[PDB]
Structure formats: C-alpha cells, structure tokens
Amino acid sequence: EGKLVIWINGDKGYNGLAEVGKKFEKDTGIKVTVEHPDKLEEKFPQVAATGDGPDIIFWAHDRFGGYAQSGLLAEITPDKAFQDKLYPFTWDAVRYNGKLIAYPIAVEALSLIYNKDLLPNPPKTWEEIPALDKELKAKGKSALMFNLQEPYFTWPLIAADGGYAFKYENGKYDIKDVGVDNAGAKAGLTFLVDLIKNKHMNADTDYSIAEAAFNKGETAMTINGPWAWSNIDTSKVNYGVTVLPTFKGQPSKPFVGVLSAGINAASPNKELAKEFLENYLLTDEGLEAVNKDKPLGAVALKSYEEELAKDPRIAATMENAQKGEIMPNIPQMSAFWYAVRTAVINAASGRQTVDEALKDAQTRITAARDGLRAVMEARNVTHLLQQELTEAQKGFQDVEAQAATANHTVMALMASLDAEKAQGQKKVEELEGEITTLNHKLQDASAEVERLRR
Amino acid sequence: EGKLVIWINGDKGYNGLAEVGKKFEKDTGIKVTVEHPDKLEEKFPQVAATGDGPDIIFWAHDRFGGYAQSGLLAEITPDKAFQDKLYPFTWDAVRYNGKLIAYPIAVEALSLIYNKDLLPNPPKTWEEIPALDKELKAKGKSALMFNLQEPYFTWPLIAADGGYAFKYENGKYDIKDVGVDNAGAKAGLTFLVDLIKNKHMNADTDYSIAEAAFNKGETAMTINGPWAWSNIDTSKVNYGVTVLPTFKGQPSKPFVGVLSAGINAASPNKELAKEFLENYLLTDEGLEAVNKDKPLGAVALKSYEEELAKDPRIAATMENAQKGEIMPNIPQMSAFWYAVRTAVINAASGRQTVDEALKDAQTRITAARDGLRAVMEARNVTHLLQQELTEAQKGFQDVEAQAATANHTVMALMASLDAEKAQGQKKVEELEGEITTLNHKLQDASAEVERLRR
Amino acid sequence: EGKLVIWINGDKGYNGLAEVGKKFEKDTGIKVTVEHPDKLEEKFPQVAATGDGPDIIFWAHDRFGGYAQSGLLAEITPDKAFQDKLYPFTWDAVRYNGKLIAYPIAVEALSLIYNKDLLPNPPKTWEEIPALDKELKAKGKSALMFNLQEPYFTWPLIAADGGYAFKYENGKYDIKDVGVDNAGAKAGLTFLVDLIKNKHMNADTDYSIAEAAFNKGETAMTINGPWAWSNIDTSKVNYGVTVLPTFKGQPSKPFVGVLSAGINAASPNKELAKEFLENYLLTDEGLEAVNKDKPLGAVALKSYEEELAKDPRIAATMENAQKGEIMPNIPQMSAFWYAVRTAVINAASGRQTVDEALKDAQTRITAARDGLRAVMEARNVTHLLQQELTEAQKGFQDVEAQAATANHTVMALMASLDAEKAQGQKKVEELEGEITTLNHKLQDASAEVERLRR
Amino acid sequence: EGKLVIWINGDKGYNGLAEVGKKFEKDTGIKVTVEHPDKLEEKFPQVAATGDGPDIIFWAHDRFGGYAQSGLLAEITPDKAFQDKLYPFTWDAVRYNGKLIAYPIAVEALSLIYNKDLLPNPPKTWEEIPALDKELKAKGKSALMFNLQEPYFTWPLIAADGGYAFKYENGKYDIKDVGVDNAGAKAGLTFLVDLIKNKHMNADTDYSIAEAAFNKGETAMTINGPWAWSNIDTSKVNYGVTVLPTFKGQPSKPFVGVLSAGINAASPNKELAKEFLENYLLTDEGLEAVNKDKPLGAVALKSYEEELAKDPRIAATMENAQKGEIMPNIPQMSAFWYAVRTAVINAASGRQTVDEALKDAQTRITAARDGLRAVMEARNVTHLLQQELTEAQKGFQDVEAQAATANHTVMALMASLDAEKAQGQKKVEELEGEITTLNHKLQDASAEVERLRR
User: Fold this and answer.
1) Residue C273 vs residues A145, C276, C282, D256: alpha-carbon distances, Å
2) Which of A50, A401, A432, D73 is least surrounded, with the fewest CB atoms within 10 Å of its CB?
3) Quick one: D279 and D266 in the same domain?
4) Helix A333-349 / helix A367-453 crossing angle, nearest 10 deg
5) Which InterPro entries does the entry link to (chains A, B, C, D)?
6) Same domain, yes or no, for B117 and B242?
C-alpha cells in the first residue's frame, strides 16, 4: 500500500523495467520494486488470493484467462485514445468474457527463416517448396526442415486454408466449436504429410534436428521464433527472416503470443498501476529502456513498433503475427495441444490417414472431460443406488415381520373358527329351546280354548 | 407400584384368574387388577420399554424369546423345590440363553381324534392306516383326514423318526443346525406323500375340510387340538382322543406350546409377582379357579394335572406333549414355518420329490436373511465404490493440470535450449579470445628472449 | 420435564431464535436451549424413537411427511383465530392424512431475477424470450441462464400450463394421480427443449455457471431463490426480482418450500411447546429477532409479511409462492426428482422425444410399493453405472496415450538440454586448461626476459 | 463365539481342510465350517467391516496387503520355535509395515517344463535356446513356447539379471524405488525381443496356444506352474519339471506366490484361530489331508516339503520359488501388470524400443494411473455388487413365494370363518323370528282365554 511491486520473468529486461520504475519513483515519489522470483506463474494464484504478492504481473497472455476465471485480475479501464496506441489485434489477447483484463506489451510469432547464401529469394508459397527441394537435393541440401513433432510449428500450414482452434466471435470462445477437421485443415495437413511422403521432409524431424541442420547450412529454410535468433547469430549462417509462405492463396496462420501486464484484483494501487503502465512503460521511452536490457522483439505499441521495424526480422514477426491466430487463453486449449499433437504425429508417421487423424481430434480433445463427466454421473448413480438399498433393507425387515403375523394369524383364525361355531350352536340350541317351550305354551293354551268353547 | 396389574388374553379365564387375584388381595392387602386389552402381544413391547403396562403377562411361550431378546422380561428365580412341582419339560419352554424367563401354566399339543362308533380301537401305528382306509372305503368312509396345508399338523409324522426344527442342547438353540432333511424326516414325509399317492388322503385337504368330514362322520380319525373340542362336542359324533400313532417304532412328535406367565423387567413388584404366581396361581386351588371360568386343558402343575387326567382327552394331550418337541422361542422359527410350509405342499402336490423339497428347506430357511445380508454388503460396497469415484475425480483434475505443465514445459525447454547454447558460444568465444591474446603475448616474449640471448 | 430443547438447522438464524427463547425464559421461567446439530433431519427419527431429542424441530416441510407417517409428530391444535394470522396455503404444506402436523414459519420459491442495466423492464411471458435473446445476442449477451440440470429449476416452466406432481385432494395426495404427462407438462417441456434447440440456452447449464454468468453481467436474467441474493449483493449488479413469466397465460408453477416447526409425538411439554410457537415466535417480535440474525425470506405470518414485503424482492418471492406448487410431503416424491432429472437431459440432448421422456416419468413415479422392485431398479442402475465406469476408463486411457506423447517431446528436449550443458561446460574447461597452460608458459618466458636480460 | 468359520477359494482342497476341522472339533469341541463363496477376496472387505464373515481367510498373499492397510487383519504372534518350522522367506510374503499379518501355507512359482522324448536333457541357460531352436526347427519342432502376452510369465527372464518391481527393505517396500529400467531389466527384455526378431518365438503366443503346443509335442519346452500339470498328465507327453534357465549366470526371477491364512481383525476367537493353524493345519497330517483332496504344490512347512519334494516336480517349484520374487503386497502393483504388459507388446511388435518402453513403465508409478486404477477397482466392485443384488433378488422372490402360500391358508380360513359367521347369523335371526311369531300367536290365544271366558 502506497508503493508498487511488479513481477516479471527472469528472461526479460527487468533492470530495463526497473529504470522505468525509477523514472516513476522520481516523478510521483512512489517507490517501485521489480522482482523475478522462481516459477512465478505457479506462484501467482497462491499469493494474490490472500491479498499478497505483486500489484502487477508480466506474463504470456494465455495464463491470464486461467487467472481471470478465478477472478484474480483487476478489470482494466483505458480510454479509447489509449486503446488506439496499441494494435487492435493485441487487445483480443487480453479479453475474458468481454472484460479487458491486462495490457499488451510484446508480440511473438513464428517466421520463415532462410539462408541468404543458399537461397537469396525465399519462396512465397508452400506449393513451390517441393520443386525447390528437388533442386537443392541435387547439390546435397534440403529446402526446408522445421519441428514437426509439435503442433505449434505445424499449425501455421494446417490452419492456413481454413483451420481454427476454437471459434472466437464477441471477445468470447465457443469451447464446443473446434475447426480442426474442416476442409481447410485437411488440405494443410495433407500437404504436410505429402511433403514427408515425397521425401522432402523427415517425419521424425524435431526442434534440435531442425535447428542443427539450419545452423550447419544443410537446409535452406526453417521455421522458428525470436527466442532462436541469438542462437542462429552465432552459427554465422547469413540468414533472412520473413513472411511465412502462403498456401492455397491464404497466409500461413501461426499462433501468436503476447507478453501482457496484468493488475491484481487484490491490490489497492489499481490506479497507480494504470498510470505506470499507460503513461510510463507503454511509451517509446519506456519500452526502449526495457529493450536496451533485453530486446522485447515486436511490440504492441504502434509508435515504437514502427521504430523497431527497421530490423526487418522484427518487421516479419509482426507481419506474421497480424496474419496469425491469437492463442486462446482458455483452460481447454491444453486439451487442444494434447489432442492436436497426437493427431499430427499419427498423420505424419503413417499410423493414420489425415482424415481419421483429424476426425478423432473432435473426440479426443474431450476425452478428458467426457470421462470426468462419467465419473460425476456415476457419483450420482451411487447416491441413488444407495437409496434403493435402504428401500430393500426395509423391504426385508417388513417381509420378516409380516411372516410372523401370517404364521400366528393362521392359528388365531383356526381357534376363532372353532370358537365361533361352538358359540354358534350354543346360542342356537338356547334359542331352539325357547321355541319348544313356547310351542308347548301355545299348544296348552290352544287346547284350553277348544275345551272352553266346546 | 404397590399393586399388580396382569394381562391375559380374552380367550382365557380372566374372571377365574381375578378370583385368584381377590384371594391374594385379601391375604396381603395388595389389589390385583386383571386385564385383557386388544392385541396385547403386539402392545406389550411398546409399554414395557417405558416402565408401563402390566407387571405380569400371560402368553404363548414362543413370543417370549422375542421379548427376552429385547431384555423386556425379568429373570425369574424359583427354588428347586418349586421347580419340581411342574413337569421338567415345561421349563425348557421358558429358557433363553440359560436364563429362566417365565412361569409355565398350561400345555397344548395335537392328539389323534377318532370316532368311537366307526372305529372303537384306533390304530397305534401310521403303518396300519393304509389298510384301515381300504377297509372303511368299502363302506364309504375314510380312515383319516387332517390339515395337510400347514406344517404344525404334518410335522408330528415327519419329525417322528428323526426330524427336528433347530438343535437344542444346553437351554440354547443352534440356529444353524436344522434337522429337516435328515433321513428320519425324509421317511416321515415320504410316508405322508405316499398316503396321498395311494389315494388314502387328498393333498388339497385343509383345516375346514378335515373338520367338516370328521364332524359329519365321513372319516374315522383326524388330528387336532383342544381348541377344537367344544366344536366337535356339538356335532355329537362319539369321539375319542388319544395317543398319536407311532411311525417306524417311534412316537409321533407334535409341537408343544405352553401358556406362560412372564414378569416385566421394568416392574418394581418383581417379588410380589413371584409370590402371586408361585403360591397362589400355580396351586390346585388357583388353577382350579381359572379352570372353572375357562378350562386350561392339560397343565404344567403335576399335582393338578394328575387330577384333570380323569378326562382322558387331557391325559392324551399331555402324553402327546411329553413325546413332542417344545416349539422354539426364537425369531428364526418363523422362517422355519415359512420354509417348511412350502416344502410340504410342494412335496405333497407332486411339484417336487420329497428329497428336493426337503433339501431346499436348508437354502430357503435363510433366503430371509441371506438376502438381507447381500443388501448390507452392497451397502458397504457402495461406500467403497464412492471413495474410488473421488480418487478418479482427482485423477482427472490431476491429468488435466499436468497436461498444461507439459504443454508449457515443451516451450520453456525450447527457449532454454536456445538460451543455453547462445550463452554457450558467447562464453566460448570470450575464452577463445583470451587465448589468442595470450598466444600473442607468449609469442612476443619468446621473440624477445631469442633476440636477447643471440 | 420443565425445559424446552429446540432443533433448527445451522444456516438459519439460531442466535435470533435463542433471543426469542430468552424472552420466553424470562416471562415464564422455562429454560430454552437452541442447537443446530449436523444432519439433524436424519438424526431426528433415531433420537425421537428413544424419548430423546428435541421438543420442537424446525425443517423444510417435505421431511415432515416421513416423520408423521412414522407417528413421530404431535398433531397441533391451534384455534381458527390463530389459523387466520397465517396465509391459508401455508397450512396445506403441513398436512398428513387430513391432520395438521406442524406450524408454518417461512416460505420459499424461485423467482425471476434480472439485471436492470441490461434489461430495465422484465418480460411477463416466457413466449417473448426468444425474441428478446436475439436482441441481446446481437450485443454479445444472453437473455436467460439458470440451472437446467436440476428439475427443481426447470419445473416452474414445465408445470406452468396446468401440470403438477401429485394431485392434492383434501389433506393428502392420491399417490397414483399424477400431472407429469397431462396436456400441460408436455407443452412446457417442449418449449424448454425448443429454447435449447434454437441456441437460446446451453443444455449443460448448471447452478454454478448460471450464478457466475448473471453475477458478472453476461446474461440479462437468471432464475433463483433468496439464498442466491447475498452473492449478487456483493457482485453489485443492479438487479431486480419479480414474478416468473407466464406460459400460455398461466403463471409459472415453481415448487414451494415452507420451513415448518413440528412437535415430538411423545414430548413431555405438549402445551408449553404450542405456547412458545403460538405466542412468542409467530409474532412480529419473534420473527424479527430471528430475521435480524438471518433473513427468513417471505414469512407465513400475515402481520410480518406485510412488513417485509416492503422489500419488493420478498414480496416477489411470496407472489411466486402463492402462484406455485407446495412440495408433496410423501415418500413417493423422491423418484420424481430422478425420473424428471433424466427426462430433462434425455429430451434436451435428444436421446428421447418429449412424449416418451414424460411417459417414462409417468411410469417410474406411479406407483411404488418398491421392496423387490427397488432391487431390480438397482440391477439396471448398475448396468448404467458399468457403462460410465467404462467411459471414464477409456477417457483416462485416451488422455494417458496423448499425455504419453507430450512426455516424449519433453524428455527429448530435456535430453538435448542436458547434453548441450554437458558439451558446453566441458568445452569451457578445455579452454580454461589451454589458458592456465599458456599463462604458465608465458610466466616463464616473461620471468626470463625480466631476469635473464634487459 | 465358540465356533470357527473359514473361507478358502473353491479350487483349493476344502474337503481336505474340513477333515482338518473335524480332527480339531473332536480334540477340543469347537465346530469348524469351511466354505468357498464365489468372489470371496472381494467379499471379505465388506463382511469383515460389519462383524460378519470368516474367522480365518485363505488366499494369495498379495491381496492381504490391501486388507492389512485397512486394518482388517489381526497381527499374528507365533514363537520363533514355530517360525523356524517354516522356510524363512515365506514370512517375507506375509509382512505389511514390518508386522506379520498371516500364516504362510503354500508356495507357487513358474517352472521350466520339458519333453524328454524331444529333449531328454533340458538346458541350464537362456542363452543356449536360439542355438537349440535351430537344431529343433530342422526337424519341424520349436524349442520354447509360453505366454508372451502376460508379464507374469515374461517377467522371469526380464528380471533375471538383477531386475525387480519395488525394493523390499525390512518389512515393507519403498513405493518409489523401482528396478524396472535398471541395467538388468533392459538386458532381459532385450533378449526376449531378440528371440522374437530371430523367429525363435511368435509375438502373439498366449497361454492357450502354448499349453496346446507343448501338450501335443510340438515344442520341446514351455514355462508354467503346477496348475497346468494335470492337463499334461492326460496328454501323456513324457515330461520333466526343472529349474528355469539362467540369464547372464543369474537365476531366473519368476514371481513367487504364497497361499496365506489370515485372521479377521475383530474376530471373537483370537487364540482359537491361531491354535487351529499353528497346531493342526501347519503340520504333516493337516497339510496331508488338504494335499490329498487337491495338491497344494510346494508347502511352507519344512517337515512336509522334504516329503513332497520326493516328487522332483515339487522340489523344482520350490527351487524356482527361492530363486524368485515374492509378489509385492502393495496396491501400486496393479500399475505394473498394465505398464509392463503394454511395454512388452510395444517392444515386441516394434512400436517402441526396449529403452523407451521400460522408461514409460518406470514413470507410470505414480502420476496419472492413480485415477485409472480407482476406475478399474470400481469396475470389479460392480461385479461383486451385481452378485449381491442377484442374491437379494432371489432372496425376495423366495420369500414372496413362501409368503404367497401362507396367505393361501390365511384366506381360505378367513373365508370359512366368514361363511360360518354368515350361516349362523341367518340361523339366529331365523329363530328370533319364530320366537316373536310364537309370542304373538300365544299372546292372542292366551289373551283369549282370559277375556273370552274363565
């Protein structure tokens, strides 16, 4: 309270950011402390939920939908003037149910990487890569090698013509709409598989294999991110970085990830953070300071991005990001990765046709939750089936009780049958006795009248 | 408190008993009230369990084991001198776990009933009845007709040679030992079934059909109890009552039931009841008074029984009771009746052979509780199976969480691979730079010594 | 014996009630202790049956049918001067076989709740909701959201047009006359399915979802009880509470639950209990003390309901209640919840049609008497349980397979990372050797220009 | 209370064990019943936990770790004079958290079985088998065939060279110390895979196939337990039973199973059950009675094992016991059978390598198959639950049947009683008619002597 504590990961320019913190400390008297604690993404939900930890946290936007789901983040309110300082599409990476929940900072995305010496004019279209490889193979090189084991890297081509992870309409994801076996994704994947079939790529090619091959000049092109540049730098291949090839006319569609600054729902300093982010960090001065300590890569702030774009590699990254699909910030996306990962490997390794591989994603992406659903139906079915067991229990105590009554009743009734039957005749003979006596009285009176009348 | 209230059923000599109550009231000043309330056997366990109702209750001994099981009855303490005033075997009808729990009063049991005019010398053995019937059939009569639908009436012959309900050893019943399919019972039943096969009896003969037949002089003999006498009296058949026929040398073994006076565990007047029963009711005077109001039939009190025996019918009853099997006072006896009932009907109607009918009694006797036992195992199985459902529930939350870690870890590791690799070569070239500088220093020093030494 | 122990659930205002019991302890001198034992509805039948437990017991009236039937509850005898102080229908929920068995205290019913900033004038008919949802979906919001899983919530709509559970005749229900697939219920349920068919609602909308949706202003309307308000109060949505819409001109027919106060059959303090309720609790001052501790919602006492109904919400709940269905206090009702819970899902997800889904309800409801049937219904339940444990089993097996493949990648990278670190750290020691070596060689040369020579 | 009930699976010599109980019933007087309820292992945890079921339970020792963990078993306390009568290592299979929880009775392990007319001298090492299969294939016969599908069989070879499931430490298992991809396991599985690669075995050889092969003389050898012998006896192949062959000079490590006798935790007969096992069963005479009914195989008792070992086969099984792995009595072990089962298939059919397959077995303990196991234990529990419900259903149907017959009597009687009441009441009014008719006629006659005349 009265000061701002901020968490950013250790692989970012925290000192650079502290500098911005000091400029703020000077101008308002508010001391800003910047920290990079160990695995802070895991640490965040634990300290925010007891009014502790950072007033503001910098992280990949995808972890944030999980935090907003637990109401951990403050809703942010930037006037539209400020909203037009950043790229439209970056805001879409920081919404949850229509509420804006964090400030976009950086933008990251795969790009085509190529050896200028081997290939000074990288191709624009996937379609021409086969022919290009047949050429380079004749001088002991390959056209392209990139990580096929993972979907993050194979998606761009697959999504190109029509795929999508989850439909997005109004700042909201329909988690039941999955565009992974639409005719477009099938075309994407077929092509990719066909490249393997026609021995232009190896299905067992992963990250390290690709990286090594490019760095040793064994392949003309590869696909990869800004995280990889300082590595390729020191191979001293002469490498170009540029727009991903199109497919069937359409841009490749690589997933996009966005370093974002979010504010703690718990924090009291909500407006002093809003200030710090809006007026000190998200400016050319502020981003430049962080950039000096460690490059951010392509940024969300239009004005400063336009400066960094001198570096064509940073130009490419953003060009690709703007043609790509923001990576959905919803819990279920990890099911997507899981499912899609297995889908592709199978499709590639021959284990499945594209069609069956992609058709199963629809089933498998929910195998997690359908099974969990069956566990909870079964939970209820046992409550019911326990009730029925009570019912049977008293059914048996009942039957046992009403057996005794039947056995005893059989005999009661026998005694009664004899009682009322003996009581019967006894009353009868009494009455039948009264009759003979009256019969005799009437006989005796009648006999007298005859005497007297005669 | 200070007085005795006593409950007896309405079909007994309650006025007779009140007279005994008045003799007591005179001699000790204690007013005794005698009551016959509606279904008092059902009413007893409800009033005794809140210190209410009668100080003493007269009822059929079999209901009393159920009462003692609920500790409702006081344990009685009659010195051995008093014990020898009643017939030994009667006391066995009033034990529960070795504790004497009531005073025996009256004894009831089936006897052979026969038409003196049709058959002045009733047979002594079941074995001679077929022949007898062939004789009497030739003059339009039957030898024997008695209630075959119920086991209480068919048992005497079945048990004759070896059967028993539940084994009885030390004032205790082994509820797992049931002698209903031992070779003896098989012989008894076979005979009975054979009588039906050889058209000496009808399988569909019940109590009313038997009674009618005997009372109209259509049959020479029947089997029945004292409850039935006053009924037969008024048919004015000239009837004898005597020992049941033997089978295979052995006496018939009819069940025996004993009117017994029990004392409330709750009652404070335990020693004033002991008194009343021991010294006023269980004497010749006392029983005689009750007898005047309503005959008890054969009694437990040796001395007075020996008087009543002048009536040979009452002699037979007791002779048959002493050769019979006290009717077990344990809850499970109603399963016995249920099982054995169905056994015999089936055996008689052709629906089953004797052997299979009797073998099933062993199973069916416990359908009852074996089935209840399954309901309660199943009750526990559900508690367990609900626990496992919790386990599966967290198994799924787990798996879903550790999919997110895996997806994020795949990428963390990719970045790290590039970080530590670029960091790698940067340290290497620094060191490799220090090397050339030292290489050049040493060269320059070495070039000097050569100059100077030369 | 001269002391009043009262049971009332924990989530009620028991410190309030405690205050009423002290105002009573004052004006008479009889100590009153209130408790709130866990699972006290299920404790009561065990404690009452041994003369122990409470003189008065507070609970939702439907449980009191179970108690009455076991003869655990005393018949209350209030004058018609008193009876008129409460709303006529609150007596209909405390009747068993004509007899009044408990005192009504509070009344509860779903009501239609709405966000005024998103919808200032709530609709008066169900039929206008689709039209209204379209309007709202246009600006990325939904019309209505409320727990579809549970029948308790769906019923109001279904039973609206002349539907009902069991016919209430005089003071009981005919257990075999049922309004579940009469004209009314079919039409209603048809409409509920249409809303899901036409995408206006999701088939798997539960309580937890529907609360969060409304309470964060995603949806214009929900359906819910007084229990759900304080959670809205904290969310600060500007909400209103009103009459549930009409369907076919008829009011929605939500269930009514009426907190009743019953009296133990064999309680020593008969008139004293009556006295407390009639003259101390069921008065403006008693109910207030309670209400101040925890809100009872609408109350049965006219005098005080007119005070509380100044709160348009409490007035609304009571309106819906008068327009709604009392919960039958008969055992048979517990098949209703199950039969209708599955009927809903089956008609919704399309596994059955509306006619056949309500015909199976019709059947399972009417009638019991269960016992052996219960056991066969378990037999079929466990086939269903088996299917689900199957589904859960292949759910895990699928996730496990796909989890196996992310782990393939993860160990691969971890491998390469560990390898990279090994290679690098060895290369570094190789160089640091070269350096220490050269440093020595130079030390010699150097130390031998300085000495030998200059 | 003064009686001993025992459970033992049906395929065991229970009529023999009964003979041991009669020798026990004679010399003391305590009756001892032996039963063999279906699915009794699953039954026991539900019957123990309601003070029902058996005093002692006979089963494979692995199931007893589950029971011990729930506290259902009594800790046995035998003197070291007794302990020494049994082979040291049998007591390692009846320990849970250091405590002895049952008596060892019999020992079972896989042995090497061979056909002497095809191979008079069986090999002493796995390594010579390919060499020997070549020799045999030449004359159209295979060296070895046994169940490759099941790990229980394939384990012996895999575990040979220092492999193990979980480390046994003192009296427990370090649940996290696992020998499944140590140096030993890999080498063994590798050999098993090679045998399949080089066409010495078929990948899809299961039990059924292997038996029929060996039993019809198509293969020189098979691997199997005592249970398969009697089937060979009949086929009449001339067969020997011997130690399993060594791998890398190490004895094969087949799973040992010890049939053990456990005692119910809350059994009224504590010292009596101990008395029966220690002094009557675990003795030459006792074990003989049981072995005469059905062979027990190896026995834990020294005195009688040296007798049975005159059968070379039995000595052979004992030798492979001692040289084998006692089954861990811990829940976690069920993951093993699965993980490994797949591991073996995968490594065999080539879908994984030996290294990566055994690493996946290494991991699946703990992690994801927490939940999946619980689902599958639910899956088997419902099978027990279905048997229970079955038992209840025929319990009801039985009593229903017998109830129906008692009612038959009851209604017949009530009919007769109602007929008798009718018949008589029409008589009594008939007479009362006459009596008032006669009175009137008399009144006239009489009134007409008094007036007319005198």
Assistant:
1) 87, 5, 12, 71
2) A50
3) yes
4) 110
5) Maltose/Cyclodextrin-bd, SBP, SBP_1_CS
6) yes
Residue C326: strand, helix, or coil: strand
Backbone φ/ψ region at A79: left (φ over 0), alpha (ψ -120 to 50), beta: beta
Read off the CATH number of the domain in which C329 is found: 3.40.190.10
Q: How far is Cα C36 from Cα C54, in angstroms, rounded to an integer?
A: 11
Is the C-alpha dihedral spanning A339, A340, A341, A345 positive or negative?
positive
User: Does A372 contact D at CB distance below 8 Å?
Assistant: no
CB contact under 8 A, B402 and C403: yes
Among B442, B448, B454, the residue to mutate for chain C (most C Cβ within 10 A): B442
Q: Is B286:B137 a contact under the CB 8 Å cutoff?
A: no
In this structure, are residues A58 and A37 in contact, taking their beta carbons and an 8 Å threshold? no
CB atoms within 10 A of CB D29: 8
**Interface test mutation site (partner D, options B208, B377, B380, B405, max chain D beta carbons within 10 A):** B377
Provide the token pair at B80.
Answer: 């051995």
Do D57 and D37 fall into the same domain? yes
With a CB cutoff of 8 Å and minimum separation 6, the contacts of A109 are: A225, A254, A255, A256, A257, A298, A317, A318, A320, A321, A324
CA pair distance C113, C232, nearest whole angstrom: 10
Question: Does B213 map to a domain?
Answer: yes
Look up residue C210 and give its two tokens.
Answer: 């529907």
> Residues B33, B127: one domain?
no
Which of C75, C109, C89 is closest to C168 using CA atoms?
Answer: C89
Gyration radius (Cα) of chain B, Å: 42
Q: Kindly state whether B221 is in contact with chain A, defined as any CB-CB distance less than 8 angstroms.
A: no
Verify that B115 and B245 share a domain, yes or no: yes
Instruction: Give C374 to chain A, closest Cα distance, Å.
Output: 5
Residue at token pair 């009659």: B78
Same domain as D93, residue D32: yes
Between positions 3 and 62 of C, the ones with CB within 8 A of B are 51
The reply to whether D263 and D214 lie within a common domain is: no
**Token output for C168:** 């209430």
In whole angstroms, give the CA distance from residue D384 to residue B102. 46
d(CA B5, CA B59): 15
Q: Based on the fold, state whether residues D136 and D283 are members of the same structural domain.
A: no
Kind of pairing, strands A32-35 and A4-7? parallel
Cα C247 to chain centroid distance, Å, stands at: 24
Backbone φ and ψ for D202, nearest 5 degrees, come out as -95, 140
Give the domain range for residue A334. Answer: 150-201+330-367
Separation of alpha carbons B112 and B224, rounded Å: 7
CA distance D215 to D200: 19
Distance of CA A126 to the CA centre of its chain: 30
